[PDB]
Amino acid sequence: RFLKVKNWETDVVLTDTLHLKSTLETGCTEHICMGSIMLPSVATKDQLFPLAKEFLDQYYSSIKRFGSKAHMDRLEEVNKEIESTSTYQLKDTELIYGAKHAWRNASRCVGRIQWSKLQVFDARDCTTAHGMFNYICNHVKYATNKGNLRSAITIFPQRTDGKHDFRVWNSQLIRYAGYKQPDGSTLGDPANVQFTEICIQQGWKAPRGRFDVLPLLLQANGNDPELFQIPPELVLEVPIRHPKFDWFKDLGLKWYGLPAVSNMLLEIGGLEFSACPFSGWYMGTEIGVRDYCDNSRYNILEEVAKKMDLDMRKTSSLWKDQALVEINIAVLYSFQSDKVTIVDHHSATESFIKHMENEYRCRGGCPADWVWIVPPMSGSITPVFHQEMLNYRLTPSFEYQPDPWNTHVWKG
Amino acid sequence: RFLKVKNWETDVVLTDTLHLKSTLETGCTEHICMGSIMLPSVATKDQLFPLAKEFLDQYYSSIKRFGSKAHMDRLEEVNKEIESTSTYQLKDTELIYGAKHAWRNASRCVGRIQWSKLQVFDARDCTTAHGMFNYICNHVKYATNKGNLRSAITIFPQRTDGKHDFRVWNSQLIRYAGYKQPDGSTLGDPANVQFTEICIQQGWKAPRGRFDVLPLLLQANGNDPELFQIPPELVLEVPIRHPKFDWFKDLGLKWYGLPAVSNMLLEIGGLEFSACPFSGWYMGTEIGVRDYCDNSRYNILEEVAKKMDLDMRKTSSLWKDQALVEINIAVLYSFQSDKVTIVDHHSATESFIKHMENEYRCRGGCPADWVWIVPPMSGSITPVFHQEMLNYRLTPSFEYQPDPWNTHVWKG
């Protein structure tokens, strides 16, 4: 009941007792491990108060007033508010704590050494899609900070009945369009071909190119969503060049600077925040490996290998591996030369080991998802490959949720 | 109870019902996933017969005579033999079936598309360490087959009381020595520094160099183990050259051709085979990535990057990644040019997807360990990165076991 994780490169051993406070379930049983399944698995007033109490007992414990007067009155205050409304409202401090610890608790995030340096924007007074656009625009401007990126989260009103939900229908605030073709090929980003078309249905006028920044589809208080174009001056992009190969400019690639996830759900004290877009900065491999080289994404290994004059006849010439390394040198170089924040997989995975040591020491553990923490190239030459990790669900947390277009009681 | 695994690059979905026949436990619970822990977790006559029956019910089912006369008589025959001796003996056919399915069932092995082409050598008549040397020598000769490698397993007598065990104390039949230094550095292979010294204690005369093939320490029928030198003519090695960089010869590296694991335990029908060395061929990344570039192994990224004239000042120049790809191009090229069998991570991971489709179709599933199946470089540009896998323990199986020097009632 007091488990041990080992690093097999350093022989360092850590003891996890934090998993005892774990509540949710993982998908694994004693007879089957599901640690490589991508997505594993109304709210009544009965269930609500224990979730509120559990959250408030760790909030007040955290500020060194566990069980004090203010704790008991706040516990009774929330209990009384859940009697009257069968829900409740977080104090501003409780909202900032909740958000930072949802990030702290995200076992799939290698960036978490920053978890406490997070700027929380309280958008709970928002009522319309236009107000969402405004709040989201100010999030982008602040987070980008002229390339010196800053982590931030914007939190729209919590779910109530369920049919009144705030949702951002984009997967990321900033995301390139994807259009199919007559010959069945795909221009832009094949990830977003369905969403790109959805914007066209609600009325987008698409400039059918490669790197066309999608509009925002914003749904407020359960109403039908509404399209808005982020002003291009707020959309910072980085043209990708190589520090050796000058044909790399001719590739004419580019990516946006600010990764900002917008389709997830934030749980705090049993309250559900269906619209909570959050942003930090990129680890280089996300762009150079997955975005650029996934077969079902931009899929550019073909062209880069050609221009490098590689032996592409055989699998075993490792031409794919060789062109993958050049591409990620190029992403990093281009971002850095522009003073736009980015971290390479070596620095980020090292920081995550250091972060792990902090969490085990001053918190008794750090939930971690090896399948997601290990980067998608050069796995074993990063220290996290050799680090055993225990995965488990702690709350507050970021959860997946269905896409709004599959659940929204459409209204035409 | 009828689970679904998805490939997120091909959108292919498979249905696993094979996990229902799973027996052993994984280490995971409903509240904690341990899929990245390296090693998770006498035998009485009471427990023995169900294990025998379970094995015999699937053996006879496999040859299309489930429940026939021969099945029932064999079930009674084994029951009667477990009454008299509280153990039993496998028929030769049952031994070959068991071994092939232990391999078939090995969720950490990406090579399993070959699982039925396995040469089983019955060494159960062996009684002395000299006989073990002889059997092991014939295994090496056969498996190597002039570079056209062939999978094989040699099976020494099963454990009985426990204090009479056959063990091979080497981790692999062929393995390079590791010696420390006055300045605390290490020559050869740091993995085997303890075992290298153990051979020196029992009497080895070490040629203190880099790539010195260790002697065999062979323990028969519980007696103290005995040293034997494999004749060098049976030890096929491959000098590593690069197809472009001619300084790569000056690196003067080499590896042995035949990977032959010797420290594992084979369970068949409740019977334990403590000495069962098995051999196939290498996936290139095992040598070029782990053996050569693990920090606690040969650790050569330093020198290869130097001779490539790389910017080693910064982490983010990705010089480590760049020199890692060259090194694995070199391992593959050198093995192939010599007609010594080897598979590159791209071909091997593709074959494992194809194998997965076969197992789900004609068997209802394929237990698979994503943490181990995904290769240690270029992860997401192989199809197994994008393949969800269910892990679970089926029997017959290969299990870990303590090193004999930590358990053997030593006798001096």
Ligand code: HEM
């Ligand atoms: C500040 C720098 C950050 C870095 C370098 C970073 C890095 C990463 C990476 C590489 C992933 C894997 C994503 C993928 O492969 O699709 C990830 C996942 C994730 N990150 Fe972090 N992140 C950062 C900030 C944040 C912030 C500020 C939050 C929340 C407020 C956050 C929450 C998450 C969550 C919830 C996931 C899991 C998403 C999923 O399960 O699909 N991250 N992060």
Ligand code: HEM
């Ligand atoms: C024929 C070509 C084969 C290939 C290409 C292959 C490939 C691999 C690789 C790359 C690993 C990971 C090893 C590591 O990273 O330490 C592995 C593990 C394993 N292989 Fe296969 N293998 C082959 C044949 C076999 C055979 C013939 C057997 C048994 C008779 C076998 C049984 C296993 C087992 C039990 C493991 C897990 C070892 C562990 O858990 O540490 N393999 N294989």
Ligand SMILES: N=C(Nc1ccc(CCNCc2cccc(NC(=N)c3cncs3)c2)cc1)c1cncs1
């Ligand atoms: N459609 C598919 N399914 C699919 C389903 C779910 C997902 C989940 C993808 N999470 C995107 C994500 C999440 C968190 C952080 C980042 N990155 C960052 N650095 C930051 C962003 N904000 C602050 S930091 C990116 C992805 C794909 C697929 C098709 N082919 C392969 S997957």
Ligand SMILES: N=C(Nc1ccc(CCNCc2cccc(NC(=N)c3cncs3)c2)cc1)c1cncs1
């Ligand atoms: N000492 C350490 N612990 C440690 C504990 C356990 C282990 C287990 C390592 N299995 C070695 C192995 C197993 C199966 C197949 C192959 N390869 C093949 N292709 C074949 C061989 N035969 C037929 S195919 C190699 C490894 C290390 C470490 C220190 N640093 C990092 S690990």
Ligand SMILES: C[C@H](O)[C@H](O)[C@H]1CNc2nc(N)[nH]c(=O)c2N1
């Ligand atoms: C099938 C598999 O679980 C899927 O590819 C996962 C693997 N690990 C990952 N790791 C990260 N960071 N991001 C991903 O999208 C995935 N995908």
Ligand SMILES: C[C@H](O)[C@H](O)[C@H]1CNc2nc(N)[nH]c(=O)c2N1
């Ligand atoms: C900590 C972690 O489980 C350990 O590095 C595992 C990861 N995956 C692996 N995968 C393979 N094939 N071989 C290994 O030795 C390991 N080591």
Ligand SMILES: [Zn+2]
């Ligand atoms: Zn698990």
